[PDB]
């Protein structure tokens, strides 16, 4: 029957979706980082270098 442990399990079940969301966000951000890294890292254009650096910083902050 309903008890303290069952309620704990329900609440953890609801809160584990958040962890799944967080890890999915992690892997998406790291896939973007890989797309930036494995792709040529030439920074000849100052604007391109600044944009890439700010993207990296933004993802790290996130």
């Amino acid at each position: 029957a309903f008890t303290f442990a069952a309620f704990c399990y329900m609440l953890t079940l609801v809160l584990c979706a958040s962890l799944i969301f967080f890890v999915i966000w992690h892997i998406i951000a790291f896939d973007e980082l890989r797309t930036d890294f494995k792709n040529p890292i030439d920074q000849g254009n100052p604007a391109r270098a600044r944009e890439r650096l700010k993207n990296i910083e933004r993802i790290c902050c996130l």
Binding site: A1, F2, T3, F4, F7, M10
Partner: protein
């Protein structure tokens, strides 16, 4: 009969044929239980 009663034989037979062969078992708080308010948590 009296000797058996003092020796406890009759009580043992009583327990055996009434309880040690019963289909059922052998044998409190007014505080609200979690079953009363389960729907709230659900």
């Amino acid at each position: 009969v009296l000797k058996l009663s003092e020796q406890g034989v009759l009580d043992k037979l009583k327990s055996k044929w009434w309880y040690d062969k019963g289909e059922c078992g052998s044998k409190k708080t007014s505080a609200l239980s979690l079953s009363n308010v389960a729907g709230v948590f659900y």
